[PDB]
Write a protein that binds this ligand. Structure first.
Ligand SMILES: [Cl-]
Ligand SMILES: [Cl-]
Length: 162
């Protein structure tokens, strides 16, 4: 198991524009297109992202390409972030993947806002961090996926994904 396989299980793969759990236009493997309510604004962002007139549909290769960019960006965002970087550096490989997953999902700013949780992770207080992580809109809105990430943080294993 690795970050790619982990996020692919969590996000799934869709080749046609779809709406995410928040109702936003997305495509491929959790690639957010726009928060705008316009489907046209979504196709536009899509064509721009892919470099061709897609008419809202992409191929598997194209999906995987956006995915690779998105993972790469998540990692680089963590490393550039003063709040996130020290947490990431402190963790083991498995838990690093959990942090990347959260960043992929809610963006760097979102994650950096989990001040108390971050401190607990840095301190290696696993059970405590897991409890604090659950007291969030994140957990309440997407509980099954949040539990998988939380368990990963708590245990340091891939059990939740197997
Ligand atoms: Cl892009
Ligand atoms: Cl869920």
């Amino acid at each position: 198991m690795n970050i790619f396989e982990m996020l692919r299980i969590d996000e799934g793969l869709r080749l046609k524009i779809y709406k995410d759990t928040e109702g936003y236009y997305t495509i491929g493997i959790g690639h957010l297109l726009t928060k705008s309510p316009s489907l046209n604004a979504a196709k536009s962002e899509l064509d721009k992202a892919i470099g061709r007139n897609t008419n809202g549909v992409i191929t598997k290769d194209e999906a995987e390409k956006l995915f690779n960019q998105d993972v790469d960006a998540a990692v680089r965002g963590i490393l550039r972030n003063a709040k996130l970087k020290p947490v990431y550096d402190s963790l083991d490989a498995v838990r690093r993947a959990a942090l990347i997953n959260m960043v992929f999902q809610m963006g760097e700013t979102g994650v950096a806002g989990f001040t108390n949780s971050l401190r607990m992770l840095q301190q290696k207080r696993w059970d405590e961090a897991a409890v604090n992580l659950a007291k969030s809109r994140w957990y309440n809105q997407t509980p099954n996926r949040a539990k998988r990430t939380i368990t990963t943080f708590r245990t340091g294993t891939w059990d939740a994904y197997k």
